[PDB]
Write an enzyme that holds these catalytic residues in place. Structure first.
Site, short mmCIF file in Angstrom:
data_model
loop_
_atom_site.label_atom_id
_atom_site.label_comp_id
_atom_site.label_asym_id
_atom_site.label_seq_id
_atom_site.Cartn_x
_atom_site.Cartn_y
_atom_site.Cartn_z
N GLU A 78 -0.55 -6.42 5.35
CA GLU A 78 0.72 -5.78 5.51
C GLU A 78 1.85 -6.70 5.92
O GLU A 78 1.62 -7.81 6.37
CB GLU A 78 0.56 -4.66 6.53
N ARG B 93 2.68 11.36 4.38
CA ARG B 93 2.61 10.59 3.14
C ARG B 93 1.68 11.24 2.08
O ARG B 93 0.59 11.72 2.41
CB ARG B 93 2.12 9.16 3.44
N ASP C 272 -7.02 -1.03 1.45
CA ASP C 272 -6.38 -1.59 2.60
C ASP C 272 -5.76 -2.87 2.15
O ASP C 272 -6.48 -3.75 1.70
CB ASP C 272 -7.37 -1.90 3.72
N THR C 273 -4.45 -2.99 2.16
CA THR C 273 -3.80 -4.24 1.81
C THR C 273 -3.37 -5.00 3.04
O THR C 273 -3.09 -4.39 4.07
CB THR C 273 -2.54 -4.05 1.01
N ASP D 10 0.79 -1.24 0.00
CA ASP D 10 0.00 0.00 0.00
C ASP D 10 0.83 1.29 0.00
O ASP D 10 0.32 2.41 0.05
CB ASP D 10 -0.94 0.00 1.26
N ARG E 168 1.03 6.85 0.02
CA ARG E 168 0.10 5.87 0.52
C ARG E 168 -0.98 5.74 -0.56
O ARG E 168 -1.60 6.72 -0.98
CB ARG E 168 -0.45 6.41 1.80
#
Length: 136
Positions: A38, A82, A35-36, A16, A30
């Protein structure tokens, strides 16, 4: 209207997050709206499909001839400094490609940075329908 801007790959960090040279400045981006799983997550460090979503984002930006960033219409950086953007590798949106493969779910969206939300939700519904990766 949103517009694409050129950027240069410095390094992929996680599924992500990627570091890019943008306007001659190194920064961490970002990926908006996804939502990946992690590999750099507090408490729950390396999650199921975290390796695979990291590898997919890395392979997509590393093999790209051109990377472009597209900011949405609200804030452009989050509280960690980010950049918040849709990232394109040779015209294909990395944020959508991850959701379409079942390597990311669409995040809980609020606020003005929501332009491609319905597009991503359609891709997620297809990945779920096909029982891919996160959804298998």
């Amino acid at each position: 209207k949103l517009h694409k801007e050129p950027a240069t790959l410095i390094k992929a960090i996680d599924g992500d997050t990627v570091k890019l040279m943008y306007k001659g400045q190194p920064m961490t981006f970002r990926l908006l709206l996804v939502d990946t799983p992690e590999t750099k997550h507090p408490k729950k460090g390396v999650e199921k499909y975290g390796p695979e979503a990291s590898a997919f984002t890395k392979k997509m930006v590393e093999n790209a001839k051109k990377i472009e960033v597209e900011f949405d219409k609200g804030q452009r950086t989050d509280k960690y400094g980010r950049g918040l953007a849709y990232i394109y590798a040779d015209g294909k949106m990395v944020n959508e490609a991850l959701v379409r493969q079942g390597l990311a779910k669409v995040a809980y969206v609020y606020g003005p940075n929501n332009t491609h939300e319905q597009h991503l939700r359609k891709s997620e519904a297809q990945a779920k329908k096909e029982k891919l990766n996160i959804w298998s």
